[PDB]
Design a protein around this nucleic acid. Structure first.
Lengths: 119, 51, 82, 67
RNA sequence: UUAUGCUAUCAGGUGGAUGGCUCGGCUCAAGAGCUUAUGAAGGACGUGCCAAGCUGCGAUAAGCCCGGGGUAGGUGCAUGGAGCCAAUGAACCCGGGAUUUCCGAAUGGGACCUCUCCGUAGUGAUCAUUCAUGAUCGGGAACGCUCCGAAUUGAAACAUCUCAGUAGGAGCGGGAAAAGAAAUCAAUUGAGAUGCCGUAAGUAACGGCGAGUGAAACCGGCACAGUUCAAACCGAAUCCCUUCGGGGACAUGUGGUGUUGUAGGGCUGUUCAAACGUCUGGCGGUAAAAUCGAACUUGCCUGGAACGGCAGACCAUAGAGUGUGACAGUCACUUAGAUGUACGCCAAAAGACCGGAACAUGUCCCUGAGUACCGUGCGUUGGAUAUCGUGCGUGAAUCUGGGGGGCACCAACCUCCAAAACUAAAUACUCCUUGAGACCGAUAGCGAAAUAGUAGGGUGACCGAACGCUGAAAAGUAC
RNA sequence: UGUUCGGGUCGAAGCAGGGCUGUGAAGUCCUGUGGACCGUUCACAAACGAAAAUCCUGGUAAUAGUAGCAGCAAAGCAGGGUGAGACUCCCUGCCGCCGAAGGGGCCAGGUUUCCUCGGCAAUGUUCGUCAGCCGAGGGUUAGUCGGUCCUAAGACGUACC
RNA sequence: AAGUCGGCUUCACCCCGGGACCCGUGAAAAGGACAGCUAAAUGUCCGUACCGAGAACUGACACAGGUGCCCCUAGCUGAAA
């Protein structure tokens, strides 16, 4: 969150860079699918490790997979199937920005998830 | 064999254990971005301003 | 406030076990009386004497000579040294 | 999970808390003694979690007026 | 094959300019504004599994506990290994607690030393008429008040003067401080606390009358607020502590009345009746983290990657902006606009309480002393025989009184009542918070885009750097 | 900066070289390189233009493979090892230095240089496998040795002034 | 492995005593002794490595300087260090 109090690039980027962890949680937001947005009443939600998302920008547009990992400090997610093959030949996962993906299936093992997404 | 008190010897010990290189794992963690250190010194140079 | 930090396990410190002495890193604030009483409370062994030095790491080392034979070995086994 | 929680500490008794504190001190002594040999600990986080559990126990004790 | 060389270009090395980017700096505006013996700021030492610096923390040591928001990750700068923690709701943020070594106002004594001695376990020093207890000490970017106080420089030298009550010093001290309700300013007859701004005005005034220095009143504004003692009259009718029994102060006067100028108050008498103010009360505002907040991630092309081009679809009280693999109102955070919020702060209705205001009468009483004034010396001032201060000397009056009206005295007229006390607001400043910017953009901008008052230099007072950038992703080059 | 009109991943700025225009300050374009920003109309501003200051900061030449590595003090040689590499590190022998100091003990001062293992990018005036260098680990034990106690010249604290 | 004996000398070290000089007349206080013997307990804290110098200090240096010195120094020659 950064209000129109400060329209200065220095203050916006400082706020993003020194955002606390509870604010970096909100940086993991991604667009919900049409069904999910209709059945939740919100347009976006935070990507969580486990739920299925479709990558819609980058080299891996259209791939659906489960979030393997989430780094809040990096602001990145790790999705099943989104990998870079390294000079060894072994496959490392390529971190993605959550704004480049779209949630298609939500993980609902946590009862707090509904109010987490909205309200 | 100059004679130090407890605090003087403690401060000399602190200086001695400060006089160490940055850990290799620290260098790896910082990606060769923290390799240097301001408290490196040699014993036969400008002495400590500690004692 | 316990004066004893932990048993000190180096070659010279392990050489004490064969003469029934045991070496500890202790709080530098504490003195020989406090170290003796705290060790006696900690392990239930009567301490015959305490020798103490200060190191260039800023630590204090204490070699404890016990009165009961095998007390050093038994404390080392209780801690997990032996 | 951790060694023992705040609810567990408040559930135990005074002597139970003292006994657990003594056991934790013994484990900390043993682990610091192992680290004294230079070799890496078998559980690097074990030492720190023991220290924080000891701090939690002491804080509960001070709240409960034991110390 | 002409070497050693010379000139030009090209390739490469060194180097780190240029360009671009920038979580930094600087300035301005709006807020907010004290803290410490219940041990502050600052420093030393310790504290991490591998941890040396910084940062945080204090032997419970990059941390512990409780409540709220947040919810799936976390383990600082700083994605390395291995573990640990977390759905018993962590991390993080807001509030409240605990722990909190030694030095340090530092305060049992001493400190060469940050420790050490006695341990009788510590009210160190100076103080407060109950000896129960209480106050002061140090710190704070600048600002505020009191006092002490240069020279360079200008005068084209220099001494009065100027520089300048500046620089610097000492004391005190808060969120502001100081001042503050005329012994005033006026001028023919008026105004009516103080402060600050504008103007008066480079005027009056001072001045080798040179150079220069330099007001105030009136008037226009910001903000507005008035009062309490001493005494006269009464005479313990009071105030404080308390273990609620009592104790302390107090007739050398606690308390009631009273507080001032075309005089006021007291005492005597008559009348009208009681305004301001203090307390209770918490309607309602303000108010933590924080919550919600529209509308595309559609086709083709280019591309590693669209936020681009060309078509298409939408929102707008939201087209400020930032991030996202290239230019994004519709991808994310946001934004416009609404919500919520513990402790607190202000706060209206409605109640409890001391009480207020006129006149008549007058051989009546009271109304601030080394004070006001004056002589002389010195400083300061525009203050000139007419500024203020204070050293010495001298020194009054009491309402039929006293002071002022820019030399003294006389007279007239006008004006006030000192020598005791308090008092919000308008004002100053910027450690700090927020915002903004024809500001700088890494030799600039703070010295510091910082492991920066650091490395380093000086015995010390003190002086003081350099160093930003892989890439979309380590995919950090297997064999 | 306001404002008008634009360019750019089908490659902006910058950079090296070149073509054209303009008297010129300069502008524009081409090739290469570069990888994300840049111009333009009318106006307005300034921390606005460098060849000079024994200018400042940084970088880097000629000097130049030059001086120095020569008084210390007679300084090494043979053989055998170690090692990828040996005048320079280790052993034996010979030959030498100091020998009322260059040996021994210790104050102040230093502050880990002490010991062991593993190294040689820098340091060592050459080399180096060696090392007071680099990295890792270890090492200092007191009733009797000192401080601690006492007071000296003389400081410091409190009180008074 | 011997490990037993004698003699000489002896500084620059220890004890003791004498003399001379005054011109500096050459410290103080703690402590100790003079009434103690026996038996148990206690004796805390700090320093302690190593250099102490033609390479461990200081002079920017592994610097021909300087830095407390020793109440430290063996045989011959020689008065003798």
């Amino acid at each position: 969150m950064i209000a129109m109090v400060s329209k200065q690039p220095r203050k916006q980027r400082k706020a993003r860079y020194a955002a606390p962890l509870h604010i970096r949680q909100k940086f993991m937001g991604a667009r919900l699918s049409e069904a999910l947005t209709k059945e939740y009443g919100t347009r976006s939600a935070a990507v969580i490790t486990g739920d299925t998302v479709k990558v819609m920008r980058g080299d891996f547009k259209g791939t659906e997979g489960k979030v393997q990992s989430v780094s809040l400090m990096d602001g990145t997610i790790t999705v099943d199937g989104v990998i870079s093959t390294k000079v060894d030949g072994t496959e490392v996962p390529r971190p993605l920005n959550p704004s480049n993906v779209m949630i298609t299936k939500l993980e609902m093992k946590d009862g707090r998830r509904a109010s987490s997404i909205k309200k | 064999m100059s004679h130090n008190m407890k605090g003087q010897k403690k401060r000399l010990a602190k200086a001695h254990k400060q006089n160490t290189r940055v850990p290799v794992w620290v260098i790896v963690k910082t990606n060769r971005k923290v390799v240097s250190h301001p408290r490196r010194r040699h014993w036969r140079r400008r002495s400590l301003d500690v004692k | 406030m316990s004066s004893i930090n932990y048993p000190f396990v180096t070659e010279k410190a392990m050489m004490l076990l064969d003469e029934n002495k045991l070496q500890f890193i202790v709080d530098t604030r504490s003195n020989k009386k406090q170290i003796l009483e705290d060790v006696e409370k900690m392990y239930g062994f009567k301490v015959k004497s305490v020798r103490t030095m200060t190191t260039m790491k800023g630590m204090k080392k204490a070699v404890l000579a016990f009165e009961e034979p095998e007390a050093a070995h038994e404390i080392a086994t209780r801690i997990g040294l032996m | 999970m951790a060694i023992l929680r705040t609810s567990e500490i408040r559930t135990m008794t005074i002597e139970e808390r003292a006994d657990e504190l003594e056991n934790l001190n013994n484990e900390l002594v043993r682990e610091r003694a192992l680290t004294s040999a230079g070799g890496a600990p078998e559980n690097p986080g074990r030492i720190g979690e023991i220290r924080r559990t000891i701090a939690r126990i002491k804080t509960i004790q001070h709240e409960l007026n034991e110390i």
